[PDB]
Design a protein around this nucleic acid. Structure first.
Lengths: 63, 117, 146, 102
RNA sequence: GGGGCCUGACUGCGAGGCCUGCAAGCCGAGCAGGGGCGAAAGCCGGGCCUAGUGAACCGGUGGUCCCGUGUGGAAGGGCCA
RNA sequence: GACCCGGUGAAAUUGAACUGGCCGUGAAGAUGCGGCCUACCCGUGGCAGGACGAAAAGACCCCGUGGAGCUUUACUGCAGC
RNA sequence: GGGAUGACCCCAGGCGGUAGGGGAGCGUUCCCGAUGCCGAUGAAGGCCGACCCGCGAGGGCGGCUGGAGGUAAGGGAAGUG
RNA sequence: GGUGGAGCCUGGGAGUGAGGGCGCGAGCGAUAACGUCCGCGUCCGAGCGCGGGAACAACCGAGACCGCCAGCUAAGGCCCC
RNA sequence: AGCUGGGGCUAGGAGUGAAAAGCUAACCGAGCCCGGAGAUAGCUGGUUCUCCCCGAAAUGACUUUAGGGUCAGCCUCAGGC
RNA sequence: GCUGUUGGGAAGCAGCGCCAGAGAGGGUGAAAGCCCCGUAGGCGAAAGGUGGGGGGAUAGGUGAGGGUACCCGAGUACCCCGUGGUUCGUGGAGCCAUGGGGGAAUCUGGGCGGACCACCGCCUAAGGCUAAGUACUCCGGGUGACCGAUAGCGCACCAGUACCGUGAGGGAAAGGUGAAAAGAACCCCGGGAGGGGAGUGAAAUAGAGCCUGAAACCGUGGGCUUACAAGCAGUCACGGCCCCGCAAGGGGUUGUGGCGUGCCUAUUGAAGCAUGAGCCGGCGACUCACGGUCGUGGGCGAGCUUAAGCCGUUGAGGCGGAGGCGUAGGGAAACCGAGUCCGAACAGGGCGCAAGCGGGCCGCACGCGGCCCGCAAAGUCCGCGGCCGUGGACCCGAAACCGGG
RNA sequence: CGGGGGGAACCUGGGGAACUGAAACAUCUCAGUACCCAGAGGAGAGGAAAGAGAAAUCGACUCCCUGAGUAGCGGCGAGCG
RNA sequence: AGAUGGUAAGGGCCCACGGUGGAUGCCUCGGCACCCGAGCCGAUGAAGGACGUGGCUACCUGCGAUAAGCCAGGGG
């Protein structure tokens, strides 16, 4: 029958206009204890490739 | 629709059985045995068509040799005359002159060994 | 036009791909010739290796919702006066939905770019900068819904 | 399903095999009656025809004929138009034709 | 190696790159905020350098303008640390 | 009993065979490739060295995030107390 | 490159191939074509064929058997070799 | 310079992630192994297609579209088989 | 503590057992039949007509991973440069 | 609708007509609207069900202010504990059900609006009953790009049989003479069975598990060929012999001489002394459904498009815009918007947008308007095809687990 | 007066698995599925709001299309919805 | 001193004709799917059967000691 979106993915990565997959930078939910502002800061969003391609394929019905 | 086998098979089968006539034992009564035997027949030919072409070059050379030797020289020297002299002719096949026209052949030899004198 | 000749165009290619015979896609069946492809592989959209999928990336979308459900809310779908200059006279949602945008998509904003025609535009909210373009002849209907 | 309905009633026109009537002298629902009406029209029987008129009385005849393919207005499709060599249509079944096309 | 002041073991960013299957790791001038030391030029976003480490998920403390299931406020979350 | 004759008349096996020896070779143990040696065609009664002979998808070994039986201070539950 | 687009001829290169990608064909069954056309002067099937067309898969054609069904072009479906 | 079944960008579909011999430079081994592990290259794999090497995947020669009772050669040979 | 006929009771994690994991209708460390069921099988095997073009891999990273996979590498088809 | 014609047999072919609201189809010695049964179309029940589709009959229901403040379903509401249902798995866990303990009230009541409280609203629990629209197919009928006797139900046939098992249970094989029995009087060999003539038939190699009759396999006769030999059984080259041809030439056979390591599978590598196969015939493995994603053929494009179902047919279609994708993106969100997020920042940076034209042609306003086109800015809808997802998803194959017997 | 017993599927209520999936596996899945039991009928169940949920709203229930793979639920895994 | 012919117990290859056997084609009293129709039986003894019934009767159907049939209405 029909297809189910993957909530796991839907909950952590956003898909943009150009069809690009964008998600937070992984490495700071707790690592830290002292990491030079630079590291702990430098955390906006980012991409992937051949990998985001794999994502979009799970967020179909949610386009 | 139900595309039952029916006619189709039985036809391709007796088609190989035909190519396989005259073979020993089952090589001609069994599609399988046939099928195989034929494959061998397939390449044995192919290869021998190319062998045949080399087969007759031998026949000729041996004769060509035997002829211009009982005359005076060998096959090594003989083909060098008809080559230095420039008579890019005979063609080991047409060297049946040694069989038919010895008077014409002997002529070639004489104007061949002479190409060395 | 004769009965027996309306024929499929030049690309209906019913040519499927049977994979059984001597020449063509065949025997081990056009593809595969190893194993673990005999009745199923794992994915790979998101699976295998046996390792961290690629699920090492964390959830930002902070607000996956409590259990009661998503919260009812007025939904605003903005429109471009750019696509608005297709008709003249009275411009109000309803004549807007059955026309182009919205389609019961709740409320209607209004912003866009490009030249704006000097008329009346009945909207629920106007974008600052894209409203100064209506300061060059036009209307300004606001609020509503009750 | 329309551009394809109009286009079929198009290659029937250019061929000339198209033709719309209005009257049916020998009607009364009898084959013998109809069979005549054709001759005195151009319908000898050398061209399988498609009859499309909103008058059952007429169908009554055309029906039981080999080279003739009865029908009705609402049921105006493409498969029949094409399977038949010559097309005949009444002005009432034709009247709706366009209401359907545009 | 010694001395005097100090807290830049900064906040907000980051051009352009090293490296690389992924994600990671590393370098970074320069602009702004507000400072240290110096007359100044300037240098300082820890340590002469390469090890001293651990995705996500689940939770805890702070903060905070975000959401608060009819409304106000809650309970509970989200965001930043 | 086996052997000969009349009567009835199976079986596992079975790629197809026109199925010799020796040195050598070859996926390292050849009737089947190479060189040489032998060798008329077909049976019948015997012997068991070879056809890696038959039989049984090795009972050993390993592998499979295979299965079952058994244990206990493995984990986690439950009957019972 | 010809270019009376003429997929019909010229100039020069290429054409071993497993897993596999890609491209065109052959046959089978059923459907439209069909109130049509083959048929007892002989269907489908079968048995031969050294003959004819295709590189091939195949396809024609002839004799014999057989005695009642068969089905072009052009397409369409699928229990299709 | 180089127009090559070269490249570069986007996208559909793959198979493969058991390799093997040989030569060369190393480690391991005993400078033993048709051993084992890396490195550059080659060949077999997929060229068990053809010539030479007696026979013989990978050594020498050489990339097999078809046909030829035509010729020049490569390796290797020219006393007989 | 004998042997035996007839009549009866006890059964599937259950029975019975002078104990062998023995017997429970000719293979019992958990009977048989039907069903859930077309269990699951990262394993073995099999996988059908023709022709034409191109043509791999057996490495890297990670993997309760090591004869399985995911991304890259190497191949092919369509478009672009 | 008869006749002539071919033939065993016309319905075939032929001459001239005819019915048709009926040219569906089946049968008849072959192939027929018009010969037989039917068909379109139109009638039919004394009896038995069916039966508000249509009228009655009753059952039963019929009224608004203003004062009281009497009744509004109890081990119940409600709270706590233990669970179940729901999308809800302890969660902020309400709501609905209830095994246990406690335990009211009668509208100034009480339940609910996802803890809880306050406002604002919604509905009246603890008694029942209730057509139609929905689900299924043993049987009956009707159609089929459903099968055709290894197919199709297990069974076309005396099959849930034969047969197997103590039992539950398992579970077969097996259709066809011809138009018609006209199924072969009688005679000959024989005990019979079988056969040879005669006889029937158009046909008897249609003679009775009899149409067709394939291949494996078994025989008789004939042609070529072999007892000094050596081999994956062939292939190439000559030559003898037999044979159809007017002949160039072509068959069948095999005597010499040349060259040759089965097929499949698995493999770094197989003729391999690795796997599989006695041989033949038939059954036998990459499918469909719904999503998705690329390619591709068309439709239409500021758009595209229907779903269930409704009026139509009964191989004919329409209607139906609920709804879905697209037209704008950024942000966790409030939210802002060609911007937006991070930020104090008319620093920066991350996702974002900025999108056209060769020009057919034309009102003859010396304006390229602007239709249209490749199909787009840009997309959708249907078709076809590759691969992906959920399904037993390429086919066979476990040891095993569970449930009822 | 009634009941008992039967009936292919369908139906409601009372009970209720495991294999599988998670590439192990306990929660989770499979699943309130298969199966047992009771009852009822041509249907059954349900059914006139102590309902929905934000609209000065709606107004028995059953059933189909949508909403919707939405809101959420979730070793926030698989997957459910 | 010499040489190529010939014998076939049997075998092989080809051709002919039979046999065994039952594929293929063609048949269809059967099955399969879907859609309408229609949908309960029983103490008035159901479903499903045992035995028995024909002048002679193995079996299937059929009925039931009234036994392949009995009364009555309709229908042909």
């Amino acid at each position: 029958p029909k297809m189910k979106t993957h909530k796991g993915a839907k909950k952590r990565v956003k898909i943009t206009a150009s069809g690009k997959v964008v998600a937070m930078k992984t490495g700071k939910r707790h690592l830290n204890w002292q990491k030079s502002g630079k590291e702990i800061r430098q955390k906006g969003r980012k991409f992937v490739l051949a990998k985001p391609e794999a994502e979009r394929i799970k967020l179909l019905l949610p386009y | 629709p139900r595309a039952k086998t029916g006619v189709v098979r039985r036809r391709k089968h007796k088609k190989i059985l035909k190519l396989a006539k005259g073979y020993w034992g089952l090589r001609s009564k069994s599609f399988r045995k046939a099928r195989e035997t034929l494959f061998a027949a397939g390449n044995y030919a192919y290869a021998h068509r190319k062998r045949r072409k080399r087969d007759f070059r031998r026949l000729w050379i041996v004769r060509i040799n035997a002829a211009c030797r009982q005359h005076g020289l060998n096959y090594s020297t003989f083909i060098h005359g008809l080559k230095k002299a420039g008579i890019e002719v005979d063609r080991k096949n047409l060297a049946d002159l040694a069989v038919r026209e010895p008077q014409v052949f002997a002529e070639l030899v004489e104007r061949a060994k002479a190409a060395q004198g | 036009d004769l009965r027996p000749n309306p024929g499929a165009n030049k690309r209906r290619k019913r040519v499927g791909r049977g994979p059984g015979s001597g020449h063509g896609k065949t025997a081990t069946r056009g593809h595969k010739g190893q194993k673990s492809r005999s009745g199923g592989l794992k994915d790979p959209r998101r699976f295998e290796g046996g390792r961290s999928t690629t699920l090492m990336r964390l959830p930002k979308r902070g607000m996956q919702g409590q259990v009661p459900g998503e919260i009812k809310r007025p939904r605003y779908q903005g429109v471009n006066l750019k696509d608005l200059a297709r008709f003249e006279g009275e411009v109000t949602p309803e004549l807007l939905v059955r026309a182009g945008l919205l389609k019961k998509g709740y409320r209607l904003k209004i912003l866009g770019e490009g030249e704006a025609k000097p008329l009346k535009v009945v909207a629920h909210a106007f974008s600052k900068s894209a409203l100064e373009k209506l300061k060059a002849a036009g209307g300004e209907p606001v609020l509503l819904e009750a | 399903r329309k551009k394809g309905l109009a286009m079929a009633v198009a290659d029937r026109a250019r061929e000339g095999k198209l033709l719309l009537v209005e009257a049916f002298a020998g009607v009364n629902g009898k084959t013998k009656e109809f069979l005549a009406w054709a001759k005195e029209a151009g319908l000898d029987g050398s061209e399988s025809v498609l009859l499309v008129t909103g008058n059952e009385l007429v169908r009554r005849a055309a029906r039981n004929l080999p080279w003739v393919v009865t029908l009705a207005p609402e049921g105006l499709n493409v498969y029949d138009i094409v399977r038949t060599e010559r097309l005949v249509m009444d002005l009432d079944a034709w009247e709706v034709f366009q209401n359907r096309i545009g």
